[PDB]
Amino acid sequence: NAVEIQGVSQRYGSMTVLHDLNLNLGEGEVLGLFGHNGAGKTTSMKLILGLLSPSEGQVKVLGRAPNDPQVRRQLGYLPENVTFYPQLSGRETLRHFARLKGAALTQVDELLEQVGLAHAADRRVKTYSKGMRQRLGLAQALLGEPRLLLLDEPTVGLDPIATQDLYLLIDRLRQRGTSIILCSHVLPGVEAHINRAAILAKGCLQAVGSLSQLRAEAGLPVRIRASGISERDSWLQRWTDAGHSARGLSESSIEVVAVNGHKLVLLRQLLGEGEPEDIEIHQPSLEDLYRYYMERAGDVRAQEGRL
Amino acid sequence: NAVEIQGVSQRYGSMTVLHDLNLNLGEGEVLGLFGHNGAGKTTSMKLILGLLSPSEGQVKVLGRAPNDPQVRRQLGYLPENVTFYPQLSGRETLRHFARLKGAALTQVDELLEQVGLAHAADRRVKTYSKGMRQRLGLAQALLGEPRLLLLDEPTVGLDPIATQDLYLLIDRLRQRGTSIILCSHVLPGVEAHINRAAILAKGCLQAVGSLSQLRAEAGLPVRIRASGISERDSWLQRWTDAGHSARGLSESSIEVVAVNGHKLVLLRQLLGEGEPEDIEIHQPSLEDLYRYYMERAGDVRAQEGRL
Amino acid sequence: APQSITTLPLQPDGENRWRLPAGEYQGQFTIEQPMQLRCEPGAVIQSQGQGSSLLISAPDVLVEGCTLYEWGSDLTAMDSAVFILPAAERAQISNNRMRGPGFGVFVDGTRDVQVIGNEIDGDAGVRSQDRGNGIHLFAVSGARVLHNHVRNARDGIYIDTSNGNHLEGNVIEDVRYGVHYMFANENSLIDNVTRRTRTGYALMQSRKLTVTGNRSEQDQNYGILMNYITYSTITGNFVSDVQRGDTGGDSMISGGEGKALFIYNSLFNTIENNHFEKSSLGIHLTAGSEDNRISGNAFVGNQQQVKYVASRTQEWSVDGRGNYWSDYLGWDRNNDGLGDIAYEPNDNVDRLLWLYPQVRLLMNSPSIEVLRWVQRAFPVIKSPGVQDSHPLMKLPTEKLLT
Amino acid sequence: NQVWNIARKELSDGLRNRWLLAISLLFAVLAVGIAWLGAAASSIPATIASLASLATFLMPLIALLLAYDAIVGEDEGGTLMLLLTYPLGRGQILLGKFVGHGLILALAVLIGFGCAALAIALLVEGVELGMLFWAFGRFMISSTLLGWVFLAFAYVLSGKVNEKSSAAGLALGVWFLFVLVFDLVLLALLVLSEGKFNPELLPWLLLLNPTDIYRLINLSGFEGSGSAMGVLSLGADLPVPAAVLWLCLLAWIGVSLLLAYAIFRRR
Amino acid sequence: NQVWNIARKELSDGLRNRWLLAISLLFAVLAVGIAWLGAAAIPATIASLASLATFLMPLIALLLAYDAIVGEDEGGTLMLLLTYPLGRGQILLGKFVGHGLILALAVLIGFGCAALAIALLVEGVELGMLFWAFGRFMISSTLLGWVFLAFAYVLSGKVNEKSSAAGLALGVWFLFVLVFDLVLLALLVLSEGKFNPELLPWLLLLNPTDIYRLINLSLPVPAAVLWLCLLAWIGVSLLLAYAIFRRR
Ligand SMILES: [Mg+2]
């Protein structure tokens, strides 16, 4: 396993800023830490690196200790809102970062092409955009053969093509065997590429699992909309006694809500009879799950429309 | 009719950075301009505010002149990235914009309850986060009953709870009768709240309309994420030979790119043979629609997961 | 001690005029009769080393052309070469060569004595404390000592309480004091040159006297030292390169770093048209000696121009014409000879160094360079010094350098 | 009016600058300290030329500390692009910034020369209170004008640059040039030519430096010596009267403010 | 060794600083223009050059390295660099080598043209005394600059923002060049009954600019203690900077 956090408890003074977190990241998975901007996410991201030390437990990066020099040669990182040395060049910043991590200089000009920075290389860092610097900060994270990545807000300021092309680079890496970690604050946009999310509140760790495992645990409805449905009335009432609200839409269509523990028993009941006619399933998204788990154990909702 | 851009061919340096768009806007609709980091979005965002001059074209904001003071009272704006005045307080910088736009000073406290900032009011702006400045930057835009918002990426650096509730405030102002123009770059996520999108690049307006109108205009496949499948190779030897690109996401979880006439008949294979634990059907989103229009006119996709 | 008549003098003319032929002589000699004796150049009147060699007691004696050698050295009994009594009025001592360890010309109580054109080489081995005076003058009125050459005596031309006398054109080399003055009221001295001397001109307590055209070349620690001189006139003196050293005795002065002019308690005197060149101190003005007419000099090349340890203002320009200063960084818009801005030679930080010598370690600091510049920007902190409105732009002493 | 509504911001933003209040209290404790040393020595014409030299070093400094980031400090802060979408013009958010920063310099020198008057009327016994009020009234309404000149310079050098790190380099360059380089270039032109370059043009070269026009106004009545003036002793060769010297100081504002508006209008 | 790999960065980043290149050009013109007024107008001109290099070589050192640590924390690259195979010692000592060779070159453009203006404009300068008095001058001016380099790492590591780092770097520059010697003069001319002036040659050792001028004026102490007291001010303040940098 890549990261094996076995019950750590980080504390600054008297208060415990991270209370009994216990994670386990497999070597091919893509994990996403989601929490508010307090001490929930960013202290746990530092404990994986060598920046802090667990005051009650221990971590295990790649089956070692988190500050060994053999570890950090095969570990990228990308912090949120970095600005590099503005009088240097694009290429000379990477050639400086190549000698520190021990990666060869031949890998530098590949990586400037790999993030699409070859046209704006050999120019000053001060005449770069916000999204242009994020390509450079990504390019140093792929130095060497990184067996672990920690991308903290990797897609802000980027093009929507370049956002989409970034996750194609991500999905290449998680098939090549390098587990990575996302740390984002925009949940649609990462919710297609998260293999298993690790949403946590202010203090503790709330829920970790796959997206199927979160929706099966958090009882939350689904919108199983189905057009072209024949005969419309006994098909309508057979969900009402089943415990659903069948909306008799006019254009031979029936909207079926559920609780998604009865998910699979309705899909074959919509597919096995022979008249589904181009249905649409609308699962509850990640921010709806984020709305649930924060309201489950860590606040109240805002007033009717406030924030 | 809020914004009636009628044949604006903006050229400076005789370069034609904005070539002949004809963009209306409804009285309550929420338009989304989703340009690149080039000449498309940010040129047309300046023409609505009146601070840029329309070379050979008319811009009739609110049926009046684009730079009257009578329309700038009835308009709000939020810029790209602001750090307002780091020595001033929280209330006083909002009280400063109150006398500028001519709003009454009773409104400056109720916005600080509306924007969740009353806990952090009367404090220095150099102590605010990136999120709190974006919270403050919304509060000046809602100042003095605004009838045309113009927000550029309003949710960056913000909490996912506060991101979700900000769109409720946007949905509050749509029902109040105020047109709103979002200009974002994080397009998966803003598609749940816009009523029409305006995707443009290479200067020219490429396409416009609602999200139903673009999918009708552009035949796009349906992503069928299937998690908890029987075996990986039992299906990826079959869906690939069926002419459907299908990748992997985990140990036992596949996604399937259909051709929309074979979505349902191949969903018969998924349920009637080897039933998984969860099936999610994705509509063609705003993100994948955005990829089509740039490939319609302009740039070709990258190769082997670069960029 | 024989007499001058005990020699063999050949009379050339019968008007009491004698002529001693070439040939050596011996012992002391005494003039008791008004005999105008001359000498051939081979008349080496060499004494044995005791007594005053040529004592003169008669008036109107024209001693000429003698060559004296090795008289006594008892300075208490005044072993001179030529002793001249008060009754020996109007003596002429013309063109003589002297070599001996005592007084060269000791006169006292005389009137109109003339010591002209002589060469008095004093000593070589004595420590400049027992060599005796070159030309000693003790309360004489009317004297005329002209164009002599005294070398390696003790304290040069000593003058004690002599009222009216001229010192014209005499060369003084490698002695302790060049010219010493003691209570010599209404004196005069013109065009004298002092070279390599532990004090060039001692001017002690003598009033109303004229010091004009004199030269001081490479002397030690005191160029012209004036103590308690009143109504004097210092016009045209050239004092050059007063280097550091020590006087060796430290009797009336102390050792100095090199001062071209040291004014001590001199109240009224005109110090004009002088030239103080390349010494460590151009002029030292003590606190008791103030308000005297000092205008027209040339303070060139000195490492520190004026030393004035006071806080009283001192204008150094009579009738609107001042002195030429080498470091005067001024301009001249209205095309006169005068500069346009006044020249302060001393800062406030230039007087902290004189008051406290430990500030010499801090003298190269940038804060000191701040402290020099803050006075130039803020004149409230400028102590009232030794400034002169309208300084000169060109050298006024263009002739004294030859 | 909108010009006062944006002036009320800068009046409440410049007074929270802690770097201003350090060097505006430094202007108060030095103007008392110069006037206290002028009381123990008595003279009178040296404390005018030293107070005018103190405000030569500090009233350009407080003016350039305030307004070097007035335009470019709002442009890269993002709040300038927002402000043009308010019912304003580019001429109102510059004249409003000039009124807002101008009342700070009118108060930073009323603290300084105000406490200098109380360190003279309570220190020098038997002083003429009419002559004190007249001389320090001329110091108050002319050190603002020297301050408003360098305020209008700072709007010129902020609109031209587009990065705040380069605005601080130019504001330090303008403060070095006008205060203690132009006084040394004019000194070195007079020394090395020995006053024979131009006997009539060189007094008119004082009018191309507003710190020298400032010193020539306050040293009108109390001339005294020439060595306290130094390079400012060329003012006796100027045939211009005193009333035009006020107007030549006001013309340094209006030329360098209309230049500040013409640069900002094509930002 | 990775202490050199981060030193090659700071050479390339320091030489493109426009603020440094403005002052280092201004340092070289004032070093010829003082030498112009000392030859056309040699221990008398090496003391006035010592007062010049006491003004600007602390100012050059504080312009380079006031934002060395806290400028990287605000830029976010400091948090990235600690995740590299790098100790906190090699980042600080590697910046000290990298910033150190800049002002070891800035005196070679500073005094390299000043020694050119003396050896070629006196014509009989007796250059055998020059190559040892300027060899002692260029060495001792670098070590003065390395003190204020190590002073800049102490104040950068303590603060949390780049704006308050320049507020302390200006404050350290005012205190150590022209406030410490003015309170030495104020302890002399205003206090004499409670200020022993024989003690004052030992209080000159508490100021690295003062130790800089004393090895250009050759005094109760020898020269070799002053070289070991200037090097101890580097070695203590770098050890102080390393102790602060481990507490971020
Ligand atoms: Mg003149």
CSV table of N, CA and C in Angstrom, one decimal, chain B residues 174-269:
chain,number,residue,atom,x,y,z
B,174,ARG,N,-32.7,35.0,-9.8
B,174,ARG,CA,-33.4,34.7,-11.1
B,174,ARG,C,-34.9,34.8,-11.0
B,175,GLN,N,-35.4,34.3,-9.9
B,175,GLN,CA,-36.9,34.5,-9.6
B,175,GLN,C,-37.3,35.9,-9.3
B,176,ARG,N,-36.3,36.7,-8.8
B,176,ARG,CA,-36.6,38.1,-8.6
B,176,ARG,C,-36.6,38.9,-9.9
B,177,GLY,N,-36.1,38.4,-11.0
B,177,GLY,CA,-36.1,39.0,-12.3
B,177,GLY,C,-34.9,39.7,-12.7
B,178,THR,N,-33.7,39.2,-12.3
B,178,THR,CA,-32.4,39.8,-12.6
B,178,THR,C,-31.6,38.8,-13.5
B,179,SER,N,-31.2,39.2,-14.7
B,179,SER,CA,-30.4,38.4,-15.5
B,179,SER,C,-29.0,38.3,-14.9
B,180,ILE,N,-28.3,37.2,-15.1
B,180,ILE,CA,-27.0,36.9,-14.4
B,180,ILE,C,-26.1,36.3,-15.5
B,181,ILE,N,-24.9,36.8,-15.6
B,181,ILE,CA,-24.0,36.2,-16.6
B,181,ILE,C,-22.8,35.6,-15.8
B,182,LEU,N,-22.6,34.3,-15.8
B,182,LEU,CA,-21.5,33.7,-15.2
B,182,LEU,C,-20.4,33.5,-16.3
B,183,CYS,N,-19.2,33.7,-15.9
B,183,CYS,CA,-18.0,33.6,-16.8
B,183,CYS,C,-17.0,32.7,-16.1
B,184,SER,N,-17.2,31.4,-16.3
B,184,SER,CA,-16.4,30.4,-15.5
B,184,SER,C,-15.5,29.6,-16.3
B,185,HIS,N,-14.6,28.9,-15.6
B,185,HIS,CA,-13.6,28.0,-16.3
B,185,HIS,C,-13.7,26.6,-15.6
B,186,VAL,N,-14.6,26.3,-14.8
B,186,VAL,CA,-14.7,25.1,-14.0
B,186,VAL,C,-15.9,24.4,-14.4
B,187,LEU,N,-16.3,24.5,-15.6
B,187,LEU,CA,-17.6,24.1,-16.3
B,187,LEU,C,-18.4,22.9,-15.8
B,188,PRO,N,-17.7,21.7,-15.4
B,188,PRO,CA,-18.5,20.7,-14.7
B,188,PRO,C,-18.9,21.3,-13.3
B,189,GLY,N,-20.2,21.6,-13.1
B,189,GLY,CA,-20.6,22.2,-11.9
B,189,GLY,C,-21.5,23.4,-12.1
B,190,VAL,N,-21.2,24.2,-13.1
B,190,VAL,CA,-22.0,25.3,-13.4
B,190,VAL,C,-23.2,25.0,-14.3
B,191,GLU,N,-23.2,23.8,-14.8
B,191,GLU,CA,-24.3,23.3,-15.7
B,191,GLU,C,-25.6,23.1,-15.1
B,192,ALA,N,-25.6,23.0,-13.8
B,192,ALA,CA,-26.9,22.7,-13.1
B,192,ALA,C,-27.7,24.0,-12.9
B,193,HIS,N,-27.1,25.2,-13.2
B,193,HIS,CA,-27.8,26.4,-12.8
B,193,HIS,C,-27.9,27.4,-14.0
B,194,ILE,N,-27.2,27.2,-15.1
B,194,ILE,CA,-27.4,28.1,-16.2
B,194,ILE,C,-28.6,27.6,-17.0
B,195,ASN,N,-29.3,28.6,-17.7
B,195,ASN,CA,-30.4,28.2,-18.6
B,195,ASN,C,-30.0,28.2,-20.0
B,196,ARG,N,-28.9,28.9,-20.4
B,196,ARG,CA,-28.4,28.9,-21.7
B,196,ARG,C,-26.9,29.1,-21.6
B,197,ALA,N,-26.1,28.4,-22.4
B,197,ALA,CA,-24.7,28.6,-22.5
B,197,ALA,C,-24.3,29.2,-23.8
B,198,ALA,N,-23.2,30.0,-23.7
B,198,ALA,CA,-22.6,30.6,-24.9
B,198,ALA,C,-21.1,30.3,-25.0
B,199,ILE,N,-20.8,29.3,-25.8
B,199,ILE,CA,-19.5,28.8,-25.9
B,199,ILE,C,-18.8,29.4,-27.1
B,200,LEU,N,-17.7,30.1,-26.9
B,200,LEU,CA,-17.0,30.8,-27.9
B,200,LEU,C,-15.5,30.6,-27.8
B,201,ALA,N,-14.9,30.5,-29.0
B,201,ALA,CA,-13.4,30.5,-29.1
B,201,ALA,C,-13.1,31.0,-30.5
B,202,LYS,N,-11.8,31.3,-30.6
B,202,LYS,CA,-11.1,31.9,-31.8
B,202,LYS,C,-11.9,33.2,-32.2
B,203,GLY,N,-12.2,34.0,-31.2
B,203,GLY,CA,-13.0,35.2,-31.5
B,203,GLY,C,-14.5,34.9,-31.6
B,204,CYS,N,-14.9,34.2,-32.7
B,204,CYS,CA,-16.3,34.0,-33.1
B,204,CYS,C,-17.1,33.2,-32.0
B,205,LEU,N,-18.4,33.6,-32.0
B,205,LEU,CA,-19.3,32.8,-31.2
B,205,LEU,C,-19.5,31.4,-31.9
B,206,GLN,N,-19.2,30.3,-31.2
B,206,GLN,CA,-19.4,29.1,-31.8
B,206,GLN,C,-20.8,28.5,-31.7
B,207,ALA,N,-21.3,28.5,-30.5
B,207,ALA,CA,-22.7,28.0,-30.4
B,207,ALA,C,-23.3,28.6,-29.2
B,208,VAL,N,-24.7,28.6,-29.2
B,208,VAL,CA,-25.4,29.2,-28.1
B,208,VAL,C,-26.7,28.4,-28.0
B,209,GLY,N,-27.4,28.5,-26.8
B,209,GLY,CA,-28.7,27.9,-26.6
B,209,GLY,C,-28.7,27.2,-25.2
B,210,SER,N,-29.8,26.5,-24.9
B,210,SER,CA,-29.9,25.8,-23.7
B,210,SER,C,-29.1,24.5,-23.8
B,211,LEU,N,-28.9,23.8,-22.7
B,211,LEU,CA,-28.2,22.5,-22.7
B,211,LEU,C,-29.0,21.4,-23.4
B,212,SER,N,-30.3,21.5,-23.5
B,212,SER,CA,-31.0,20.6,-24.3
B,212,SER,C,-30.8,20.9,-25.8
B,213,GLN,N,-30.6,22.1,-26.2
B,213,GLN,CA,-30.5,22.5,-27.6
B,213,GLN,C,-29.1,22.1,-28.1
B,214,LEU,N,-28.1,22.1,-27.3
B,214,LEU,CA,-26.8,21.8,-27.8
B,214,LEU,C,-26.6,20.3,-28.0
B,215,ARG,N,-27.2,19.5,-27.1
B,215,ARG,CA,-27.2,18.0,-27.2
B,215,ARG,C,-28.0,17.6,-28.4
B,216,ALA,N,-29.1,18.3,-28.7
B,216,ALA,CA,-29.8,18.1,-30.0
B,216,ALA,C,-29.0,18.5,-31.2
B,217,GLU,N,-28.2,19.6,-31.1
B,217,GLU,CA,-27.4,20.0,-32.2
B,217,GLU,C,-26.2,19.1,-32.4
B,218,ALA,N,-25.7,18.5,-31.3
B,218,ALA,CA,-24.5,17.7,-31.3
B,218,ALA,C,-24.7,16.3,-30.7
B,219,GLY,N,-24.7,15.3,-31.6
B,219,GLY,CA,-24.8,13.9,-31.1
B,219,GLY,C,-23.7,13.5,-30.3
B,220,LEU,N,-23.9,13.4,-29.0
B,220,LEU,CA,-22.8,13.1,-28.1
B,220,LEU,C,-23.1,11.8,-27.3
B,221,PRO,N,-22.1,10.9,-27.1
B,221,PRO,CA,-22.4,9.6,-26.5
B,221,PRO,C,-22.7,9.7,-25.0
B,222,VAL,N,-23.2,8.6,-24.5
B,222,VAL,CA,-23.7,8.5,-23.1
B,222,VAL,C,-22.6,7.7,-22.3
B,223,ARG,N,-22.1,8.3,-21.2
B,223,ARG,CA,-21.2,7.5,-20.4
B,223,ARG,C,-21.9,6.7,-19.4
B,224,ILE,N,-21.7,5.4,-19.5
B,224,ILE,CA,-22.3,4.4,-18.6
B,224,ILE,C,-21.3,3.9,-17.6
B,225,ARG,N,-21.2,4.5,-16.4
B,225,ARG,CA,-20.3,4.0,-15.4
B,225,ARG,C,-21.0,2.8,-14.7
B,226,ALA,N,-20.3,1.7,-14.7
B,226,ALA,CA,-20.8,0.4,-14.1
B,226,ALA,C,-19.8,0.0,-13.0
B,227,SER,N,-20.1,0.0,-11.8
B,227,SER,CA,-19.2,-0.3,-10.7
B,227,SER,C,-19.6,-1.6,-10.0
B,228,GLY,N,-18.6,-2.4,-9.6
B,228,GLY,CA,-18.9,-3.7,-9.0
B,228,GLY,C,-19.2,-4.8,-9.9
B,229,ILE,N,-18.6,-4.8,-11.1
B,229,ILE,CA,-18.8,-5.8,-12.2
B,229,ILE,C,-18.2,-7.1,-11.8
B,230,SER,N,-18.6,-8.2,-12.6
B,230,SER,CA,-18.1,-9.5,-12.3
B,230,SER,C,-16.6,-9.7,-12.5
B,231,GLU,N,-16.2,-9.5,-13.8
B,231,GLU,CA,-14.8,-9.5,-14.1
B,231,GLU,C,-14.4,-8.4,-15.0
B,232,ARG,N,-13.2,-7.9,-15.0
B,232,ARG,CA,-12.8,-6.8,-15.8
B,232,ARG,C,-12.6,-7.3,-17.3
B,233,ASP,N,-11.9,-8.4,-17.5
B,233,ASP,CA,-11.7,-8.8,-18.9
B,233,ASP,C,-12.9,-9.5,-19.5
B,234,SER,N,-13.9,-9.9,-18.7
B,234,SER,CA,-15.1,-10.5,-19.2
B,234,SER,C,-16.0,-9.6,-20.1
B,235,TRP,N,-15.8,-8.3,-19.8
B,235,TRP,CA,-16.6,-7.3,-20.5
B,235,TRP,C,-15.7,-6.4,-21.5
B,236,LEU,N,-14.5,-6.1,-21.0
B,236,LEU,CA,-13.6,-5.3,-21.9
B,236,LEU,C,-13.0,-6.1,-23.1
B,237,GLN,N,-13.2,-7.4,-23.1
B,237,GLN,CA,-13.0,-8.1,-24.4
B,237,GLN,C,-14.2,-8.1,-25.3
B,238,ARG,N,-15.4,-7.6,-24.7
B,238,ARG,CA,-16.6,-7.7,-25.5
B,238,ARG,C,-17.1,-6.3,-25.9
B,239,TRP,N,-17.1,-5.3,-25.0
B,239,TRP,CA,-17.5,-4.0,-25.4
B,239,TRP,C,-16.6,-3.3,-26.4
B,240,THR,N,-15.3,-3.6,-26.3
B,240,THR,CA,-14.3,-3.1,-27.2
B,240,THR,C,-14.5,-3.7,-28.6
B,241,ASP,N,-14.7,-5.0,-28.7
B,241,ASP,CA,-15.0,-5.7,-30.0
B,241,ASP,C,-16.3,-5.3,-30.5
B,242,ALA,N,-17.2,-4.8,-29.7
B,242,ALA,CA,-18.5,-4.3,-30.2
B,242,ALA,C,-18.4,-2.8,-30.7
B,243,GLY,N,-17.2,-2.3,-30.7
B,243,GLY,CA,-17.0,-0.9,-31.2
B,243,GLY,C,-17.3,0.2,-30.3
B,244,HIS,N,-17.3,-0.1,-29.0
B,244,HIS,CA,-17.5,0.9,-28.0
B,244,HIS,C,-16.3,1.0,-27.1
B,245,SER,N,-15.8,2.2,-27.0
B,245,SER,CA,-14.6,2.5,-26.2
B,245,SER,C,-15.0,2.4,-24.7
B,246,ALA,N,-14.3,1.5,-24.0
B,246,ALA,CA,-14.6,1.2,-22.6
B,246,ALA,C,-13.3,1.0,-21.8
B,247,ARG,N,-13.1,1.8,-20.8
B,247,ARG,CA,-11.9,1.8,-20.0
B,247,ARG,C,-12.2,1.2,-18.6
B,248,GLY,N,-11.2,1.3,-17.8
B,248,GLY,CA,-11.3,0.8,-16.4
B,248,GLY,C,-11.2,2.0,-15.4
B,249,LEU,N,-11.7,1.8,-14.2
B,249,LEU,CA,-11.5,2.8,-13.2
B,249,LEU,C,-10.9,2.3,-11.9
B,250,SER,N,-11.2,1.0,-11.6
B,250,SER,CA,-10.7,0.4,-10.4
B,250,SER,C,-10.5,-1.1,-10.7
B,251,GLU,N,-10.5,-1.9,-9.6
B,251,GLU,CA,-10.4,-3.4,-9.8
B,251,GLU,C,-11.6,-3.9,-10.5
B,252,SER,N,-12.8,-3.7,-10.1
B,252,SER,CA,-14.0,-4.1,-10.8
B,252,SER,C,-14.9,-3.0,-10.9
B,253,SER,N,-14.7,-2.1,-11.9
B,253,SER,CA,-15.5,-1.0,-12.2
B,253,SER,C,-15.2,-0.4,-13.6
B,254,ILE,N,-16.1,-0.4,-14.5
B,254,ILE,CA,-15.9,0.1,-15.8
B,254,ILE,C,-16.8,1.3,-16.2
B,255,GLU,N,-16.3,2.1,-17.1
B,255,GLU,CA,-17.1,3.1,-17.8
B,255,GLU,C,-17.2,2.7,-19.2
B,256,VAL,N,-18.3,3.0,-19.9
B,256,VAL,CA,-18.7,2.6,-21.2
B,256,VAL,C,-19.1,3.8,-22.0
B,257,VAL,N,-18.5,4.1,-23.1
B,257,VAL,CA,-18.9,5.1,-24.0
B,257,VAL,C,-19.8,4.5,-25.1
B,258,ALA,N,-21.1,4.9,-25.1
B,258,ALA,CA,-22.1,4.3,-26.0
B,258,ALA,C,-22.1,5.0,-27.4
B,259,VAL,N,-23.1,4.8,-28.2
B,259,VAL,CA,-23.3,5.6,-29.4
B,259,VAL,C,-24.8,6.1,-29.5
B,260,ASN,N,-25.5,6.1,-28.3
B,260,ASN,CA,-26.8,6.6,-28.1
B,260,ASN,C,-28.0,5.9,-28.8
B,261,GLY,N,-27.7,5.0,-29.7
B,261,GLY,CA,-28.8,4.2,-30.3
B,261,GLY,C,-28.6,2.8,-29.8
B,262,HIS,N,-27.5,2.5,-29.2
B,262,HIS,CA,-27.2,1.2,-28.6
B,262,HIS,C,-27.0,1.3,-27.1
B,263,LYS,N,-27.5,2.4,-26.5
B,263,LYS,CA,-27.4,2.5,-25.0
B,263,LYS,C,-28.3,1.5,-24.3
B,264,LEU,N,-29.5,1.4,-24.7
B,264,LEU,CA,-30.5,0.6,-24.0
B,264,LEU,C,-30.3,-0.9,-24.3
B,265,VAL,N,-30.0,-1.3,-25.6
B,265,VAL,CA,-29.9,-2.7,-25.9
B,265,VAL,C,-28.6,-3.3,-25.4
B,266,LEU,N,-27.6,-2.5,-25.1
B,266,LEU,CA,-26.4,-2.9,-24.4
B,266,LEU,C,-26.5,-2.8,-22.9
B,267,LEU,N,-27.5,-2.0,-22.4
B,267,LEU,CA,-27.9,-2.1,-21.0
B,267,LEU,C,-28.6,-3.4,-20.6
B,268,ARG,N,-29.2,-4.1,-21.6
B,268,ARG,CA,-29.7,-5.4,-21.4
B,268,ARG,C,-28.6,-6.4,-21.1
B,269,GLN,N,-27.4,-6.2,-21.6
B,269,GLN,CA,-26.3,-7.1,-21.3
B,269,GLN,C,-25.8,-6.9,-19.9
